[PDB]
Every structure is written in structure tokens, then in C-alpha cells.
Design an enzyme around this catalytic site. Structure first.
Site, PDB file in Angstrom:
ATOM      1  N   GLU A 151       0.803  -1.214   0.000  1.00  0.00           N
ATOM      2  CA  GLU A 151       0.000   0.000   0.000  1.00  0.00           C
ATOM      3  C   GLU A 151       0.840   1.271   0.000  1.00  0.00           C
ATOM      4  OE1 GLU A 151      -1.022  -1.142   3.907  1.00  0.00           O
ATOM      5  OE2 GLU A 151      -1.437   0.913   4.560  1.00  0.00           O
ATOM      6  N   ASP A 202      19.492  17.116 -32.220  1.00  0.00           N
ATOM      7  CA  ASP A 202      19.401  17.978 -33.373  1.00  0.00           C
ATOM      8  C   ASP A 202      20.583  18.924 -33.469  1.00  0.00           C
ATOM      9  OD1 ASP A 202      17.595  19.054 -35.289  1.00  0.00           O
ATOM     10  OD2 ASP A 202      17.309  20.754 -33.967  1.00  0.00           O
ATOM     11  N   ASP A 239       4.435  -0.376   5.995  1.00  0.00           N
ATOM     12  CA  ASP A 239       4.053   0.467   4.866  1.00  0.00           C
ATOM     13  C   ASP A 239       3.638   1.862   5.321  1.00  0.00           C
ATOM     14  OD1 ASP A 239       4.525  -1.682   3.128  1.00  0.00           O
ATOM     15  OD2 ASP A 239       2.466  -2.407   3.349  1.00  0.00           O
TER      16      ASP A 239
HETATM   17  F1  BEF Z   1      18.605  21.112 -36.854  1.00  0.00           F
HETATM   18 BE1  BEF Z   1      17.373  21.049 -35.897  1.00  0.00          BE
HETATM   19  F2  BEF Z   1      16.198  20.515 -36.744  1.00  0.00           F
HETATM   20  F3  BEF Z   1      17.009  22.427 -35.319  1.00  0.00           F
HETATM   21 CA    CA Z   2       0.287  -3.528   3.432  1.00  0.00          CA
HETATM   22 MG    MG Z   3      16.850  23.329 -33.820  1.00  0.00          MG
END
Ligand code: BEF
Ligand code: CA
Ligand code: MG
Length: 890
Positions: A293, A335, A727
Site C-alpha cells: 500500500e 538535433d 508500509d
Molecule cells: F537542426 Be534542428 F532541426 F534544429
Molecule cells: Ca500492506
Molecule cells: Mg533546432
């Protein structure tokens, strides 16, 4: 009245006249107040949604929505319907205390330590009734006339009708580092397929780099390039976190096993012929005790602790399950344009006409940085050649940097930053420009004419900046070691070879020259302009690679920059290969599975292509930590596992798409998150081990009591108190146990695995066996000859409580033991242990408590004997753990 919300596709297809008349937009007068108000009433505000913050009511209600909570409530109901009210009251009090404490802690702490995530309102320029009005973009309407200048942000989708050398940086939603020129004439339908191909339209959220333009807004709200992304991301049902599913499955299995053992015990008791009421009460108490629990409560506490630790390291986690999913990551995407490398051009390598090579340190449009040549620091006018190159790059410039923001061309900003690094930020002020030759695509060069303000008698000096092929045409001589020598063919070939070498490394070569008149200028040297990765990127990448986690990179930009960046980060091997988005889309997924994990570079990609890549990577079984900073990645960030969005060079969509927010862009923060997740998982495993050991010991003791038909050593009240200790706040205190340095150097956890290991199971079994044997020995010593006393029950309860405390003390650290963590760090665990001890003492030594619990008082000698007896399991457990770890490590 009625205006269609024109998309950039159709608006680009159509011209200015009928686009303006379709929206009833005046190109010069704009719109009146009444028309603007009507458009506001119809289409709504230009800004997006702000989501919904849940008040405390259903936030507290949802804590009661767990199946275990429903089981506890049902058990309390059946207890209160037996006209006893004792077990019902105890269970209700315990569950109310636990739920209230967890709810207040989580709600108040999260609402008090998460108030630093503030935003800023955008700005725009609007023209109404022939007057330029400074109004916010938050109230914009379709058909308005918006003026675009240098340095401002585009507020919405603008259909440009007038443009003079307008340059717009669209890397936020396209990822292309190079700004794209903007035109006025409509684009053909054949070439209107790609988003970047629309040169006659303006996208929302982009920054204007150069030039001025005016456009008419075509779409405001949720029906633009951001609007379509938001619509596609609207539902975007993300996969559930592995921790929640694993915990739910473990809890369900434990509850099913407990119910089965309760049924078996009830059947055995029925065949044995005992009291049905007492047996049913004991079975109900055991069912309450055995099921976990407090597991969700401790999970929430650990997640909150991880959130606070992230906050202390400048991070934002606006939800619970994120903290325990980064440590399970096996592959990380990134990216290039915004996360790994900023959207800032910085000069890094400088070549001198005399053969001197210069390296520039530092990133960003700031005075921070150092220029070192031949291992020596050059500042000011110490090196005449480098000083001349910097003077040519700075005087022959049009961009101005104000408050670490660039207004102008990125290469000009890089030159200004390079000048700032050596302390020549004000060098352009000493020259008065008289004649200008603006940089153009056809010419590919810029030249200016200027003289010194205090030396106007000096002959005019012309500074030229542009491509090497164009500057060399107007160059006839060069400077070498302070001497002016005629430019020969061999020197031209050497310069061309140097330019080719710079280009092979991804550097953008820019040529500089100086002279009194055109066609005679002196060559100064070449400067390498390139987008550099952030300072805290290479070390984090190396640490991640050394940790056993593969790293992939998605670019969305030209191939050459992609491979250059990947090579500089070490993620690209010369024998590796890369696949484009078009090839991925055309080629079938059934074979792409074998090609997705052997590559890490994708120069060309689309948001839907990134989502497809994400899905392919996740379909074979893995956890993906993909970052992003623009709308290009937002859908991919949402439709995946944990994503981290930069909170400085980012958009309002990435912040909502990704739960993890960095107020300061950095990459080393992920390692701390992984370490904290590993520590939280270790604490959860330790708590689960302790709870399982206690439940197994109690179940085995009850089964042994029922089997050979002797009176039960404990009653319902004692079992309920044992469950409360198991618990309760002491249980939640096991997850607040501080982190250590042993689990840090561990590789990512692999899922589809059980949390109970062989060593953990063996330790649980050993502890349960020892506890049961000790309880049986105490029982046999109690009723040995002829005596039966409630004092025996009290002694058994005290022995069980002491065994539970000793097991909890030894379960704090899985790999460490006593006298290793300190044991005196003012622990909430110690406070809870002391409170439980005082509560047990009060129960033992109170006539009302003795009456309700059916117990009796003890003696000092008996207490000393119990203390000396309930200490063998901890000592032997720590000894065997230490010797086993020593033998298996040394
Ligand atoms: F290069 Be990322 F798409 F900003
Ligand atoms: Ca319990
Ligand atoms: Mg970017």
C-alpha cells in the site's frame, strides 16, 4: 464577416491583389478598430493554448484511484460491517495519514519549487489607418499589415508584397543554417512542395536577419505552420513509462499471490476446525498487510526528490514519471541546429597571407574568447597581420551586436565577435565611411571606402570582403612579414589549396583585402567561419559513449555541415554511411530496421521522417532520449520517450512538447539525471525487498501457526500495527535514503526484467527464515511447560517489531552496511524509528492500549533480553554481505 484562413501554399500560389481582396485587407490603411475587434471575436486570439492547471480537488481525489486503495477501502468496509470497528478505524486512520501526508508534500513542494518557469510576451509592428502602431502580436488579426525590420521576430504568417533584400533565418522550423532570401512574386505550384521552397512567404517564429519588408497576415491562431504541428500533436498518445507498468504488474502479482495464500489458509483452517470469525479477521489483516500500500507513495516521493535534485541543477521536470525513465535510455538522438551547436557563426581558424596559422577559442557573440598563434596570445595590435585582418573584417561591416544579439548577416556577426575577442569592438568608430558597395549575390563581395576621423589627411583606404575567387581578381600584391611583395601565381595556388583544405573541414572561407583603390588591394588572409558546438557538448558526448549509450544525430541541414559536425563530435566514422529522408520514405520499413541502428547521421529529414525514425528505433525495444529546440523536433519530442528541450534558444512549442526543460542549455545535466534515476531505482528495489521479506516472514509464521494447530502468536491489532510500520512513514523514509557512489558507475538498465534478483530473493528468504525461527523459539520458550499468557503475545509482538526495525536498518543500503554511510546524518528514517519505538512503548505501558491490543506490561530484564536476542540477523546479514562482496570483487 467571413474570411478564409489562407494557408501559405495557396497564398504563395496567388498574388498580392486577390489575396488582399479575399481577406478584405488594405495594404496601406490596414484595418480599423471595429474590424479588428470583429476579427478578434470570430477567430480568437493569436496566441496558443496555455493548458489547464489542475486544482487540489481532483489532484487529491486521484490518489484514491489506485486499485490497492480500492482494495483497502473495501477491506475497511467489510471490517466496519462486522460490528467491531477496530480494524476498520485503524486501517482508515493509517490510509488517511499516509494519503494526506503524501498529497500535501507533493502538492505544496511542487507548487512552491517550480515557480521559476516564466516566459516573455512577443512583440510585433502593425499599421492601422495609415499609422504605425506598436502593438503586441498577442492581439493580431488576419489581414493586418505588419512591418518587418532587422532584428525583430516574425509574429505570424505574412504574405509579403514589398521586400528589399530581406533575409530571414528559418532554422527554428527548418534547421537550415543559411538564411533564405525572400521574394515577392508568387511561386510555381511545381516547386511549392517543400516548406523551405516558399520564398514569398514568412513563417511564424522566425528571426529577420537583414533587409526590410511588409506583409499581410493570412492565418492567425491554430491554422498555420505551427497550427498544423499542434493539430498533429494534439492527441499524440505517448507510450507509458516502463516503471509504472512494471510496478503495476508487480503489485498485481503480489496481490494475487497474497489472495491465493489467504484462500489456502482459510481452507486449511476450515478443515482444521477453528474459529471462523477469528480466522476471517486474521485473513483480512494479512491481506491488508501483504499487498504493498506504500509502494506508489514511495515512488512518488522518490520522483519528487529527483525533481528537486534536477531543480537544484537548473532543470525543470513538470511531471512525475520522467525522473525514472532517463536511466533506462540506450540510444540518444540530438538535433545539430540548436542543441549540439547553437545558431551562431563564430570564427575559429584564421590564415595569414604570409603562412601564419591562427586559432580562435570561444563561442557566441560575446567578448569572451582568446586568439592564440604559434602558442602565443595576440591581443590588440600586437600582431600587425592579424590586426589588419580584423580591421578589414570589422570596418567593412554592416552588422551591430547589442546585448549578445546579432542584427545583420551571420558572417558579419562572426567577424564582429572575432574583433571583440581581441578588444577591437570599437575599431569601426575610428573610420568614417564615405562610399559603400552593398554585398550582393551576383557580386559576392562588399567593399567600403573610409578614412580615419583624426587622420582625414590620410589617403583613402578601401576594405573588401567576399569570396576568394572574387577578391583575388582585384588583388595584385600581398604583405609578407611587413613587406609588400607582388602577388605571384604560386602564392595564388597556395591560397587556393588553403581554401580547399579549409572547405574540406566544413569551414566557410572568407577573403579579405585592403588598399587605396579597387583593383590594387593587398591580400591580408582568410578567416574560417563555422557554426561551432557548445563548450559543454564534447565532454558530455564522450561520457555518454563511454557509458555504453549510443548517440545518433539528426541534422535537417545540408550534408557537408552535418558530416563536419558529426566528425568534430566523434559520432561519425569514415567507414560509416548516412541515409537521406527521401530514401527512408521510398524504401520499405521492413528492411530499414536493420539499417536504423548502424547509422547515426541523417543530414536530410522531416518532422514526420524524424517521427518515423523514432518509431523504428523504439519498435525493436529500447528507450530513446531525443532532444530538440524547434518546431522541427517538437512532434518527434512528444511522440517518443523522455525528451529534453533547451529553454534559452527554443520555441514555445518545444517547451510544452518536452517535459525536461533546461533554463540554461547544457548537456552534462543528463548524466546527473541518469545517476539520480539509478539511485531512485536502487532505493525502490531496497524498499521492495524489505516489504517482500516482511510479508513473506509474516505469511510463513501464520501458515506455521495454522498448520500444526497451536494458538496464533499474534492477534489482529498486532498484525495491523506491523502492517502500519511496514508500509508507513518508516517505509517512506527508506526511499529518502541518500545516494551513493557505487551505483553511479553502472551501465543503462535493461527492461523486460524482474526487479527481484537471485541475491535479493536469497537474502529475503534468509531473513524470513531467521525471523520465523526466532519467533518460534520465543514462542516455545514462552508456553513450554503449561503456561499461556497474553504476556507471551506481547513478547511475540515486540520480537516481531524489533526484527522489522533491524531488517529495515540493514536494508537502507544494498551494497553498504553499518558505519559506512555515517549513521548519524539526522535521518528522517531515524526519526521515524524513534517515533515508532515510543509508540510501541506507549502501547505496551498504557492500560487502555493494553486492553484494546490485548497485551501486558513487561520488565526491564525482559526488554534487555529481547534487545540482545533480536540482533543476530542484522550482524550475520552484514557479515555475509561484506564477505561475499569482498570475495566477488577483490
Ligand atoms: F537542426 Be534542428 F532541426 F534544429
Ligand atoms: Ca500492506
Ligand atoms: Mg533546432
Amino acid at each position: 464577416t467571413m474570411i478564409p484562413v489562407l494557408t501559405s501554399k495557396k497564398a504563395s500560389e496567388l498574388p498580392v491583389s486577390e489575396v488582399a481582396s479575399i481577406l478584405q485587407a488594405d495594404l496601406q490603411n490596414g484595418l480599423n478598430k471595429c474590424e479588428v475587434s470583429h476579427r478578434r471575436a470570430f477567430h480568437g486570439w493569436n496566441e496558443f493554448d496555455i493548458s489547464e492547471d489542475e486544482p487540489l480537488w481532483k489532484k487529491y481525489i486521484s490518489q484514491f484511484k489506485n486499485p490497492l486503495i480500492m482494495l483497502l477501502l473495501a477491506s475497511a468496509v467489510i471490517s466496519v460491517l462486522m460490528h467491531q470497528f477496530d480494524d476498520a478505524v485503524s486501517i482508515t486512520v493509517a490510509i488517511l495519514i499516509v494519503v494526506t501526508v503524501a498529497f500535501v508534500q507533493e502538492y505544496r513542494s511542487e507548487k512552491s519549487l517550480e515557480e521559476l518557469s516564466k516566459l516573455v510576451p512577443p512583440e510585433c509592428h502593425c499599421v492601422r489607418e495609415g499609422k504605425l502602431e506598436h502593438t503586441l502580436a498577442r492581439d493580431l488579426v488576419p489581414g493586418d499589415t505588419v512591418c518587418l525590420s532587422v532584428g525583430d521576430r516574425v509574429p505570424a504568417d505574412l504574405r509579403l508584397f514589398e521586400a528589399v533584400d530581406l533575409s530571414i533565418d528559418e532554422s527554428s522550423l527548418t534547421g537550415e543554417t543559411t538564411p533564405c532570401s525572400k521574394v515577392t512574386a508568387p511561386q510555381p505550384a511545381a516547386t511549392n512542395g517543400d516548406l523551405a521552397s516558399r520564398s514569398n512567404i514568412a513563417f511564424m517564429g522566425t528571426l529577420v536577419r537583414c533587409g526590410k519588408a511588409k506583409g499581410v497576415v493570412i492565418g492567425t491562431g491554430e491554422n498555420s505552420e505551427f497550427g498544423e504541428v499542434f493539430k498533429m500533436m494534439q492527441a499524440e498518445e505517448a507510450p507509458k513509462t516502463p516503471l509504472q507498468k512494471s510496478m503495476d504488474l508487480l503489485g498485481k502479482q503480489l496481490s494475487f499471490y497474497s489472495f491465493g495464500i489467504i484462500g489456502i489458509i482459510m481452507l486449511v483452517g476450515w478443515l482444521l476446525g477453528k474459529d471462523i470469525l477469528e480466522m476471517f479477521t486474521i485473513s483480512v489483516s494479512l491481506a491488508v498487510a501483504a499487498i504493498p500500500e506504500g509502494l506508489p507513495i514511495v515512488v512518488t516521493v522518490t520522483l519528487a526528490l529527483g525533481v528537486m535534485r534536477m531543480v537544484k541543477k537548473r532543470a525543470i521536470v513538470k511531471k512525475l514519471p520522467i525522473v525514472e525513465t532517463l536511466g533506462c535510455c540506450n540510444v540518444i538522438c540530438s538535433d545539430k541546429t540548436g542543441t549540439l551547436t547553437k545558431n551562431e557563426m563564430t570564427v575559429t581558424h584564421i590564415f595569414t597571407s604570409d603562412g601564419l596559422h591562427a586559432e580562435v577559442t570561444g563561442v557566441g557573440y560575446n567578448q569572451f574568447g582568446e586568439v592564440i598563434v604559434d602558442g602565443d596570445v595576440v591581443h590588440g595590435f600586437y600582431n600587425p597581420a592579424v590586426s589588419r585582418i580584423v580591421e578589414a573584417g570589422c570596418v567593412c561591416n554592416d552588422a551591430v551586436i547589442r546585448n549578445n544579439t546579432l542584427m545583420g548577416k551571420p558572417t558579419e556577426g562572426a567577424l564582429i565577435a572575432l574583433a571583440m575577442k581581441m578588444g577591437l569592438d570599437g575599431l569601426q568608430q575610428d573610420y568614417i565611411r564615405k562610399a559603400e558597395y552593398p554585398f550582393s549575390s551576383e557580386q559576392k563581395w562588399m567593399a567600403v571606402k573610409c578614412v580615419h576621423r583624426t587622420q582625414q589627411d590620410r589617403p583613402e583606404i578601401c576594405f573588401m570582403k567576399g569570396a576568394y575567387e572574387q577578391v583575388i581578381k582585384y588583388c595584385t600584391t600581398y604583405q609578407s612579414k611587413g613587406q609588400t611583395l607582388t602577388l605571384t601565381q604560386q602564392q595564388r595556388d597556395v591560397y587556393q589549396q588553403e581554401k580547399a583544405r579549409m572547405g574540406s573541414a566544413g569551414l566557410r572561407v572568407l577573403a579579405l583585402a585592403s588598399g587605396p583603390e579597387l583593383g590594387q588591394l593587398t591580400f591580408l588572409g582568410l578567416v574560417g567561419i563555422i557554426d561551432p558546438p557548445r563548450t559543454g557538448v564534447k565532454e558530455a558526448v564522450t561520457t555518454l559513449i563511454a557509458s555504453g549509450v549510443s548517440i545518433k544525430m539528426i541534422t535537417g541541414d545540408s550534408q557537408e555541415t552535418a558530416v563536419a559536425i558529426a566528425s568534430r563530435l566523434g559520432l561519425y566514422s569514415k567507414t560509416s554511411q548516412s541515409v537521406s529522408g527521401e530514401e527512408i520514405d521510398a524504401m520499405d520499413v521492413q528492411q530499414l530496421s536493420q539499417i536504423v541502428p548502424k547509422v547515426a547521421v541523417f543530414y536530410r529529414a522531416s518532422p514526420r521522417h524524424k517521427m518515423k525514425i523514432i518509431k523504428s528505433l523504439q519498435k525493436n525495444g529500447s528507450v530513446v532520449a531525443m532532444t530538440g529546440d524547434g518546431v522541427n523536433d517538437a512532434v518527434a519530442l512528444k511522440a517518443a520517450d523522455i525528451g529534453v528541450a533547451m529553454g534559452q534558444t527554443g520555441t514555445d512549442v518545444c517547451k510544452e512538447a518536452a517535459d525536461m526543460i533546461l533554463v540554461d542549455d547544457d548537456f552534462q545535466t543528463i548524466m546527473s539525471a541518469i545517476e539520480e534515476g539509478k539511485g531512485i531505482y536502487n532505493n525502490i528495489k531496497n524498499f521492495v525487498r524489505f516489504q517482500l521479506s516482511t510479508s513473506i516472514a509474516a505469511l510463513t509464521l501464520i501458515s506455521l501457526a495454522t498448520l500444526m494447530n497451536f494458538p496464533n502468536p499474534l492477534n489482529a491489532m498486532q498484525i495491523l500495527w506491523i502492517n502500519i510500520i511496514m508500509d508507513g512513514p518508516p517505509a517512506q523514509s527508506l526511499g529518502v535514503e541518500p545516494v551513493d557512489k557505487d551505483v553511479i558507475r553502472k551501465p543503462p538498465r535493461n527492461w523486460k526484467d524482474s526487479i527481484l534478483t537471485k541475491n535479493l530473493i536469497l537474502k529475503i528468504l534468509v531473513s524470513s527464515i531467521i525471523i520465523v525461527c526466532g519467533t518460534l523459539f520465543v514462542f516455545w520458550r514462552e508456553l513450554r511447560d503449561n503456561v499461556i499468557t497474553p504476556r507471551d503475545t506481547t513478547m511475540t509482538f515486540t520480537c516481531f517489531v524489533f526484527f522489522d526495525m533491524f531488517n529495515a536498518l540493514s536494508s537502507r543500503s544494498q551494497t553498504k552496511s553499518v558505519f559506512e554511510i555515517g549513521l548519524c546524518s539526522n535521518r528522517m528514517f531515524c526519526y521515524a524509528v524513534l517515533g515508532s519505538i515510543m509508540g510501541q512503548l506507549l502501547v505496551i505501558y498504557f492500560p487502555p492500549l493494553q486492553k484494546v491490543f490485548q497485551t501486558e506490561s513487561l520488565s526491564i530484564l525482559d526488554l534487555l533480553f529481547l534487545l540482545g536476542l533480536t540482533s543476530s540477523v542484522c550482524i550475520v546479514a552484514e557479515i555475509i554481505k561484506k564477505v561475499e562482496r569482498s570475495r566477488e570483487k577483490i
